[PDB]
Design a protein around this ligand. Structure first.
Ligand code: CDL
Ligand code: UQ
Ligand code: UQ
Ligand code: PLX
Ligand code: PLX
Ligand code: PEE
Ligand code: PEE
Ligand code: PEE
Ligand code: PEE
Ligand code: UQ1
Ligand code: UQ1
Ligand code: SF4
Ligand code: SF4
Ligand code: SF4
Lengths: 171, 176, 156, 215, 115, 318, 70, 96
């Protein structure tokens, strides 16, 4: 997730349709997003690390969220009215197939819908950011730098410590 | 000795007062300005047809830098480093050593054309007319690195522009 | 192929439209702006090429950095470059903008405007003559003539 | 800003459009010229004065050369002094053309700028023919001038001079008696002679208040 | 009916021009691009703060003088009455009263802007 | 068939505006000892096409602080009103024949100010707000005097129908009867259209771009086209009002050619005036319109009410 | 240039020619070729309505002369 | 005297080798003036002078349509002038 990402911007742009369609209301999906600067610093460190020759790393964020909680927090940081409604899997797939027809960059695809609803894997046997000397930045410290663009003029100056960070399903 | 620019007093007779009233109510001076613009409309414009027509220049024009040779083909530069010393912008970098035949010649001669102020001091300082500012001025590039000249580029510029540089020097060396 | 021909023709049309109407921002810094004015003067008449000054950044296509860029001004120059709608182009004109020039080693001078904004054309001189800047603008037009946006989009 | 005349941050406190306070912020073109001069020799520091006031350049060269000559206890030859004064008057013509035309352009008169910049271009040609640079000549130096005049320069200067007065007359016909110009200029920015003296003013900014002073 | 169709056609053309301008080209909007323009530096305050009006009294006088336009407009038809004496006398009375109100506003420094 | 008429009205007007941009640029250039657009197309004949194509392929911006609805509405209203103000013009036959055409032009022209007002307010920037306030001041300056001048001139036409003006000046131009009213009307139309010396709402040297400083690409081009169409339309209105061409019912093309030549002369005079003078202060415009134009306009309105009654020259069509 | 300003002026003049001529020809085409009738007042409208009723083809511009009164 | 300038324009049309050459020189150089040929390059550039024109317009060059490898029918630039004709064309000298 970052300024030019397709993760936070993707959910923030769903306000144009009026509601947020989520499969199973997003209560059966768990996400662990990671900050862009952390990934880039990890790449540079892996270049500069001689022990990372044949290794395989897994870059994950510090907190795990339910999809419903994550999207609710996203809409709260952007100060937009949150209208979540459940959409069945086949209907969402049909919507994605319809959007796939764009000759330009599609707004969404069936594969994108599949990947959004799929929970992040837990791979504790792989090295992570911490093994390269990186402390992963939580979403609650960098969400405003992405979602402040999506606010209206009335809420443009609101500070980051106003939107009450969300609940994490951790352990 | 001084003069006044705004120290006149208008007449107060009926004739001049009526002329001023006519000027106020019928806009005489505005019509005169319109007439001046109309006169300018019908003159020939001063525009020239660049790039097919060029602006006038002189043999003293200071354009792109170049390194010159003697008629035998030997380089004129003998690495005295006076151009480097005199350069107000520290745009010239020089390294030299004895050549294989024992000549005093440079191994590195660079001019940073993004540091250069094009003052012509280097060609004044040169005692053998080795470094000159040529007549070329149309050498804009697309990258910054293309404006960092080394010895090969300057020698190529000299070989390219010698036919004009020699004639320009012949017409002006008696003033120097 | 038909589509290749159509995208080539459309790219040619859009390139001609963009390079035949270039509007530089009313923006100058130092001595080189005087030569910019002389390029706007009757002798060279940049407006006869379709080149028109406009004050607002939102109504500008080209930005000509004509003068020394200092550290106090770099935020404002970057701000007005960012507020230009795309496509946009930058012309670095003169030694000061190209690499610092006479003030390269100063404590308050940015050593080239390309440390702040990307540059398309570098016009050398201190100052470059009005004809030199005109040559730079025509070179920028020739560079715009060579863009392949729709062909590359089709090739994706 | 088109009327900022370069790099100026005027922070203005306004009630409506009435100007309650002006705060000029400068230094957006501070290049640290004096320190750099401290790091150069006397001939190397000459081109900086070309770039101090880039509208009147040979005048700055003349001032710097006069200071260095005073410190050197030497005297330029008479021909050098005559050439210096001639090109100083040409430079004054250039500066006054630029100032008046850009003042009118800021107020709203766009055309005299275009009329007079052709004469400015011809004077630039004189500059180039005498030095090889159109505006940054470095011609005037603490010994005199760098080079002698080319064999056909005085005739061309005379040809320009015998005609410049008609251009001045056309500019005056455009501006001097216009009622809109007078409305925009008369009784605007009035400064008293005592205030002008105490505030450090010089040149026209003194002479416009009746102070009879000219260096 | 014809006027309604003309208005609809003009509005549709303008709206289609806007829609073409907004959906045809490539958009790249970020925070710095969409910020307010204040000549390169951030503004100090808000543009929604009160902006004092120095010609308010002239604005109210304009409100009052606009209705005399509605009073004077039917004059081309009023010129066709049989009693031209009364019509001319009352029209001149209205115009004289308007000029008198203008003179009263002028002499009491009403047309001068506040400082 | 009426839709074909609407298109045949509005498309040539847009083309004329597009080429008026080029003509203005070339006229100003030649008045400034230069040439003007001469390169793209022979004699710059393809410059307007390039300008339009470049403007409509550029990114439009929506400011972060802007009120989006009014921001988008304002250019639509501007161009719609600019196109609409053409339908009652008799050339020599109007698209829409109205009993009160002059009142229609008055009402729609006074409605067109809200485009500038709402664009400046919705931009939510200081320079745009200053431009909008200047527009308010300008409208207050010119509206009443313009209305009284129109009434005074039409007291000799006998009605508010625009076609009757062709019959009124069948033998003599109306300018030989009301040339002072014509002078004040010309100045008032310069002030109405925000043209030099009365272009305060933009004020390039003072307010960067003024009310439209936040607009870019197509929305900005819309304001530009509305402005130039207003210029052409107001000069055509002045030509119909004060320089009446003779109309032959069996050959209206002669009248069309005559009227087009006269309105082109007036538009070129507009460009001339722009090229010849400096700009006013917007309080000085108010003082000019209220302390010089208004008393003379009132006196001349009294004069033109009295004169037909004294001279027994009252026009028909009560 | 000064005569190179003339092609653009000619193009603008040609563009401005089209509205009036087009309106005249469209009026002529849809009114039997005789200059579309004007109804500023109710009397002229009543005249047109009577013309429409007596035309026999529901078209006002179809004119019946002295051959319609036997 | 209007007939005189119209006849001059017709002769300008005829002096470029017909309508085709006239239109070629109009669309390539945006200029239809006729001058005295001074010389030609080994690359194809042609040089013309006309001393009745004011200073700046009295000398010009019609560029070649094909330089070393590129087609210069439309894309011409001032750097295609060789140094000797560069000296002549910029009025640094009087001798071609
Ligand atoms: C039941 C009847 C209901 C009538 C509804 C009125 C029509 C408006 C519908 C769309 C507007 C709302 C959408 C929106 O706000 O942003 C969308 C969306 C949200 O933007 P965002 O950045 O995500 O968030 C911004 C904030 O939420 C907030 O952003 P904001 O500050 O921009 O929101 C303000 C907006 C939000 O609107 C509301 O708050 C609720 C809407 C109710 C408004 C009705 C009030 C009554 C006014 C008078 C009656 C008008 C006629 C109504 C009758 C209609 C039926 C014929 O309120 C308005 O601006 C109302 C303006 C509409 C009036 C149109 C009149 C034209 C005048 C022309 C001159 C007159 C000639 C003489 C006659 O952004 C966009 O998609 C782009 C902007 C879309 C603008 C398109 C054109 C403007 C509106 C269409 C006018 C249609 C007239 C026919
Ligand atoms: C890479 O970032 C992204 C974008 O780029 C910033 C997007 O635009 C984007 C969404 C794609 C769209 C272009 C967003 C805008 C689409 C809306 C404006 C749809 C409006 C269409 C409706 C028909 C409006 C009318 C409403 C009816 C009820 C009538 C997404 C998902 C995204 O991820
Ligand atoms: C003092 O400096 C200044 C100038 O001097 C150099 C100017 O020229 C000047 C004016 C700005 C110019 C650059 C003119 C710009 C031209 C327009 C913005 C382009 C608009 C042209 C089109 C959008 C018109 C419509 C185009 C179509 C072909 C018409 C048909 C429409 C279809 C729908 C059919 C300004 C503001 C200025 O300030
Ligand atoms: C219908 C409304 C919507 C669309 C509006 C379209 C408006 C009409 C299009 C206008 C076409 C004219 C443009 C072409 C003029 C170029 C002239 C020529 O010179 O161009 C040359 C070559 O031109 C280009 O290579 C190609 C230009 C056109 C490409 C194909 C035309 C496509 C038109 C299709 C229209 C359909 C629009 C889409 C509708 C939805 C390159 O020369 P140039 O560098 O300049 O000049 C050098 C300067 N010199 C002469 C002084 C030395
Ligand atoms: C001037 C007066 C005359 C003009 C009259 C013509 C008016 C034309 C209409 C005005 C719009 C013209 C713009 C043309 C560009 C198309 C823009 C958009 O509509 O296309 C995409 C629309 O596609 C969407 O992405 C989704 C595709 C399908 C949407 C589902 C709706 C249901 C339609 C059913 C489709 C099934 C097949 C259809 C055929 C039966 C959106 O992509 P987007 O990136 O955002 O926008 C940027 C466009 N870029 C890339 C060119 C810069
Ligand atoms: C009022 C008079 C003028 C009215 C306006 C009419 C204009 C019509 C002229 C048509 C010219 C053709 C327009 C082409 C420009 C399209 C915009 C553009 O350049 O986008 C390029 C874009 C680059 O995308 P990527 O390479 O994938 O991403 C790289 C960056 N991430 O590629 C495209 O999307 C091009 C797709 C074709 C667009 C459709 C054009 C068809 C013509 C529509 C005209 C509409 C008029 C009705
Ligand atoms: C073709 C595709 C059609 C899509 C229609 C979408 C309409 C819409 O509101 O979307 C907002 C759209 C684009 O925004 P983005 O999503 O950020 O950019 C998309 C590019 N990726 O914004 C617009 O362009 C709005 C267009 C204007 C609305 C048109 C209708 C307005 C009617 C106004 C009526 C009042 C007029 C005033 C004059 C009346 C006087 C008599
Ligand atoms: C917006 C303002 C619209 C003003 C319309 C004025 C039209 C007009 O005056 O023409 C008069 C014309 C003819 O009358 P006379 O000239 O007196 O002669 C009759 C005998 N031949 O009158 C008509 O045609 C009446 C037609 C119906 C009235 C027009 C209705 C339009 C109302 C506009 C409302 C806007 C839509 C509502 C939404 C608000 C904005 C989104
Ligand atoms: C038997 C008697 C019957 C009736 C007789 C009537 C005859 C009366 C004769 C006098 C009437 C003349 C009308 C003139 C109206 C205004 C004149 C005027 O004085 O206004 C000026 C100002 O007016 C202007 O100067 C105009 C300003 C804007 C000028 C813009 C460019 C000028 C346009 C060029 C010429 C336009 C040609 C107009 C007609 C065009 C064809 C329609 C006042 O300003 P100040 O000098 O500051 O004086 C007041 C302070 N004490
Ligand atoms: C007439 O159009 C022009 C301007 O707009 C008024 C300018 O600002 C400028 C720049 C000069 C001012 C003082 C910023 C030039 C050169 C110009 O030609
Ligand atoms: C000579 O004084 C100066 C100006 O006034 C004429 C300027 O406008 C500007 C910049 C504005 C235009 C676009 C050149 C500069 C840099 C300047 O130095
Ligand atoms: S011209 Fe001046 S600044 Fe340039 S290299 Fe020579 S001495 Fe250095
Ligand atoms: S002054 Fe001349 S000879 Fe000496 S190093 Fe420089 S180029 Fe060579
Ligand atoms: S490059 Fe030279 S002329 Fe240009 S701003 Fe810098 S010092 Fe002045």
């Amino acid at each position: 997730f970052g300024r030019e990402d397709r993760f936070l911007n993707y959910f923030a742009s769903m306000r144009w349709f009026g509601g947020v369609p989520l499969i199973s209301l997003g209560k059966e999906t768990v996400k662990q997003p990671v900050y862009i600067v952390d990934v880039s610093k990890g790449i540079i460190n892996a270049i500069k690390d001689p022990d990372a020759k044949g290794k395989t790393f897994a870059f994950v964020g510090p907190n795990r969220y339910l999809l419903f909680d994550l999207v609710q927090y996203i809409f709260a940081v952007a100060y937009r009215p949150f209208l979540p409604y459940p959409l069945p899997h086949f209907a969402y797939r049909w919507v994605g197939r319809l959007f796939e027809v764009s000759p330009f960059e599609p707004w969404t695809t069936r594969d994108k819908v599949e990947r959004v609803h799929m929970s992040d894997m837990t791979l504790p046997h792989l090295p992570g950011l911490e093994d390269l000397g990186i402390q992963a930045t939580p979403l609650e410290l960098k969400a405003i730098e992405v979602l402040r663009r999506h606010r209206t003029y009335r809420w443009l100056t609101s500070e980051m410590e106003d939107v009450k960070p969300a609940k994490t399903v951790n352990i | 000795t001084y003069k006044f620019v705004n120290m006149r007093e208008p007449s107060m007779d009926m004739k001049s007062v009526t002329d001023r009233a006519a000027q106020t109510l019928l806009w005489t001076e505005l019509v005169r300005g319109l007439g001046m613009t109309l006169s300018y409309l019908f003159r020939e414009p001063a525009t020239i047809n660049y790039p097919f027509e060029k602006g006038p220049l002189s043999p003293r024009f200071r354009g792109e830098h170049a390194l010159r040779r003697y008629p035998s083909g030997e380089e004129r530069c003998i690495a005295c480093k006076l151009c480097e010393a005199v350069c107000p912008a520290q745009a010239i970098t020089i390294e030299a050593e004895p050549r294989a035949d024992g000549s005093r010649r440079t191994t590195r001669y660079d001019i940073d054309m993004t540091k250069c102020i094009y003052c012509g001091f280097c060609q004044e300082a040169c005692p053998v007319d080795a470094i000159v500012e040529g007549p070329n001025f149309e050498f804009s590039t697309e990258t910054h690195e293309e404006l960092l000249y080394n010895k090969e580029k300057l020698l190529n510029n000299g070989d390219k522009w010698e036919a004009e540089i020699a004639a320009n020097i012949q017409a002006d060396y008696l003033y120097r | 192929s038909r589509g290749e021909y159509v995208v080539a023709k459309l790219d040619d049309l859009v390139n001609w439209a963009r390079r035949s109407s270039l509007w530089p921002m009313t923006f100058g810094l130092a001595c080189c702006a005087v030569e910019m004015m002389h390029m706007a003067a009757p002798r060279y008449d940049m407006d006869r090429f379709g080149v028109v000054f406009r004050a607002s950044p939102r109504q500008s296509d080209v930005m000509i950095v004509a003068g020394t860029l200092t550290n106090k001004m770099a935020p404002a120059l970057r701000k007005v470059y960012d507020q230009m709608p795309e496509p946009r182009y930058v012309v670095s004109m003169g030694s000061c903008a190209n690499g610092g020039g006479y003030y390269h080693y100063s404590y308050s001078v940015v050593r080239g405007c390309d440390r702040i904004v990307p540059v398309d054309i570098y016009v050398p001189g201190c100052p470059p003559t009005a004809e030199a800047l005109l040559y730079g603008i025509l070179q920028l037009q020739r560079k715009i003539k060579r863009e392949k946006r729709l062909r590359i989009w089709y090739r994706r | 800003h088109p009327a900022a005349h370069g790099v100026l941050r005027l922070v203005m406190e306004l009630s409506g459009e009435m100007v309650r306070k002006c705060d000029p912020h400068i230094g957006l073109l501070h290049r640290g010229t004096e320190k750099l001069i401290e790091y150069k020799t006397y001939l190397q520091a000459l081109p900086y004065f070309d770039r101090l006031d880039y509208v009147s350049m040979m005048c700055n060269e003349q001032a710097y050369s006069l200071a260095v000559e005073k410190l050197l206890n030497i005297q330029p030859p008479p021909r050098a002094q005559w050439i210096r004064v001639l090109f100083g008057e040409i430079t004054r013509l250039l500066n006054h053309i630029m100032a008046v035309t850009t003042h009118a352009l800021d107020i709203g008169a766009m055309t005299p700028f275009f009329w007079m910049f052709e004469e400015r271009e011809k004077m630039f040609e004189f500059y180039e023919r005498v030095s090889g640079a159109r505006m940054h000549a470095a011609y005037i130096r603490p010994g005199g001038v760098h080079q002698d005049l080319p064999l056909g320069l005085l005739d061309d200067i005379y040809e320009f001079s015998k005609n410049f007065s008609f251009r001045i007359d056309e500019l005056e016909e455009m501006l001097t008696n216009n009622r809109i110009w007078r409305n925009r200029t008369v009784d605007i920015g009035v400064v008293t002679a005592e205030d002008a003296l105490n505030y450090g003013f010089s040149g026209v900014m003194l002479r416009g208040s009746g102070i009879q002073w000219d260096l | 009916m014809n006027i309604m169709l003309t208005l609809l056609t003009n509005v549709t053309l303008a709206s289609l021009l806007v829609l073409i301008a907004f959906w045809l080209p490539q958009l790249n909007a970020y925070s710095e691009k969409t910020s307010p323009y204040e000549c390169g530096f951030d503004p100090m305050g808000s543009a929604r703060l009160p902006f004092s009006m120095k010609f308010f009294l002239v604005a109210i006088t304009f409100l009052l003088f606009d209705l005399e336009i509605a009073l004077l407009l039917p004059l081309p038809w009023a010129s066709q009455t049989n009693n031209l004496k009364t019509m001319l006398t009352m029209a001149l009375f209205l115009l004289i009263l308007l000029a008198a109100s203008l003179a009263y506003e002028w002499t009491q420094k009403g047309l001068e802007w506040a400082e | 068939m009426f839709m074909i008429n609407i298109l045949s009205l509005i498309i040539p007007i847009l083309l004329a505006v597009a080429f008026l941009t080029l003509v203005e640029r070339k006229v100003l250039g030649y008045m400034q000892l230069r040439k003007g657009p001469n390169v793209v197309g022979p004699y710059g004949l393809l410059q307007p096409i390039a300008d339009a194509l470049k403007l409509f392929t550029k990114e439009p911006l929506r400011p972060a602080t802007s009120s989006i609805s009014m921001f988008i509405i304002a250019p639509i209203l501007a161009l719609s009103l600019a196109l609409t103000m053409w339908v009652p013009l008799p050339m020599p036959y109007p698209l829409i024949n109205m009993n009160l055409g002059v009142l229609f032009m008055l009402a729609m022209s006074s409605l067109a100010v809200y485009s500038i007002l709402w664009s400046g307010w919705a931009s939510n920037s200081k320079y745009a707000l200053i431009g909008a306030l200047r527009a308010v001041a300008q409208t207050i300056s010119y509206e009443v005097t313009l209305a009284i001048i129109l009434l005074s001139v039409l007291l000799m036409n006998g009605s508010y129908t625009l076609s009757t003006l062709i019959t009124t000046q069948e033998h003599i131009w109306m300018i030989f009867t009301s040339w002072p009213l014509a002078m004040m009307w010309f100045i008032s139309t310069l002030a109405e259209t925000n043209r030099a010396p009365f272009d305060l709402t933009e004020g390039e040297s003072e307010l960067v771009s003024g009310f439209n400083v936040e607009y870019a690409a197509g929305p900005f081009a819309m304001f530009f086209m509305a402005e130039y169409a207003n210029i052409i339309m107001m000069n055509a209105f002045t030509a119909i009002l004060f320089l009446g061409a003779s109309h032959d019912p069996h050959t209206p093309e002669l009248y069309t050619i005559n009227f087009v030549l006269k309105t082109l002369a007036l538009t070129i005079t507009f460009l001339w005036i722009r090229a010849s003078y400096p700009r006013f202060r917007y309080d000085q415009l108010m003082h000019l319109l209220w302390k010089s134009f208004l008393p003379l306009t009132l006196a001349l309105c009294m004069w033109h009410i009295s004169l037909p009654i004294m001279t027994a020259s009252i026009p028909p069509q009560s | 240039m000064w005569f190179e300003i003339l092609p653009g002026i000619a193009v603008m003049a040609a563009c401005l020619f089209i509205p009036g001529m087009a309106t005249a020809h469209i009026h002529k085409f849809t009114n039997g070729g005789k200059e579309k009738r004007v109804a500023h007042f109710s009397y002229q409208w009543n005249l047109m309505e009577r013309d429409r009723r007596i035309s026999g083809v529901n078209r006002y511009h179809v004119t019946k002369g002295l051959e319609n009164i036997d | 005297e209007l007939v005189q300038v119209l006849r001059r324009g017709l002769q300008q049309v005829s002096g470029h080798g017909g309508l085709r050459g006239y239109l070629r020189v109009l669309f390539r150089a945006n200029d239809v003036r006729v001058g005295t040929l001074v010389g030609e390059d080994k690359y194809g550039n042609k040089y013309y002078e006309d001393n009745k024109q004011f200073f700046g317009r009295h000398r010009w060059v019609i560029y070649t349509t094909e330089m070393n490898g590129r087609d210069t029918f439309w894309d011409v630039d001032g750097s295609m002038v060789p140094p000797e004709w560069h000296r002549w064309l910029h009025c640094m000298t009087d001798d071609p």
